[PDB]
Design a protein around this ligand. Structure first.
Ligand SMILES: CC(=O)NCc1ccnc(N(C)C)c1
Length: 185
């Protein structure tokens, strides 16, 4: 892929984070804390899951960014509508305003309804995410395997501004503490 030149500088929006997340001072890294991080509640915070949004909102154009997932057992990455549900239980699907992929229990899947099996020969340490707003496309790339395609959502109905979407995952196992990191351009 030759999408690298649409690179955008993503930063995390504290105010949207689940109350157990710890965001770095530069707003480029996030991890699960071992307890509530002593912040007030607000209607923006994801309540049920360890999720946070990027600060940037996209309504046009082509955008590309990279995320480091080194040594994580579980995570969700992609984009979502600015108006996604924050409170209670929900599934990651385009019907709910999410265009995402994840790792869970040693398999990779795309957030369709129902979910789609991905075929990855080289477990990724970094993921590239490409959005073409006008074309209605979200694509994922394996940076570890020379940028090979993972998955393309096409005919997307965004139906509003898009925000970068992150889930660091739970850490019941003690093996999923590692952060998500936004990689430098
Ligand atoms: C082991 C582990 O990852 N537990 C974290 C945890 C426990 C209970 N509720 C949580 N939230 C929904 C904020 C997070």
């Amino acid at each position: 892929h030759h999408h690298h030149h649409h690179m955008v500088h993503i930063t995390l929006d504290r105010n949207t984070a689940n109350s157990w997340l710890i965001i770095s001072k530069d707003r480029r890294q996030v991890r699960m804390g071992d307890t509530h991080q002593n912040v007030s509640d607000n209607k923006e915070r994801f309540s049920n899951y360890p999720m946070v949004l990027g600060a940037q909102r996209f309504s046009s154009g082509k955008m590309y960014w990279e995320v480091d997932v080194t040594q994580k057992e579980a995570w969700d990455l992609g984009v979502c509508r600015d108006s996604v549900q924050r409170k209670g239980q929900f599934s990651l699907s385009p019907e709910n305003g999410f265009w995402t992929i994840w790792l869970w229990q040693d398999s990779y899947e795309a957030g369709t309804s129902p979910q789609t099996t991905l075929h990855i020969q080289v477990p990724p340490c970094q993921i590239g995410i490409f959005v073409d707003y006008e074309a209605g496309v979200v694509s994922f790339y394996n940076i570890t395997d020379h940028g090979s395609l993972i998955y393309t959502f096409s005919e997307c109905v965004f139906a509003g501004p898009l925000r970068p979407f992150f889930n660091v995952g739970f850490n019941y196992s003690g093996g999923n503490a590692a952060p998500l990191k936004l990689c430098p351009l």
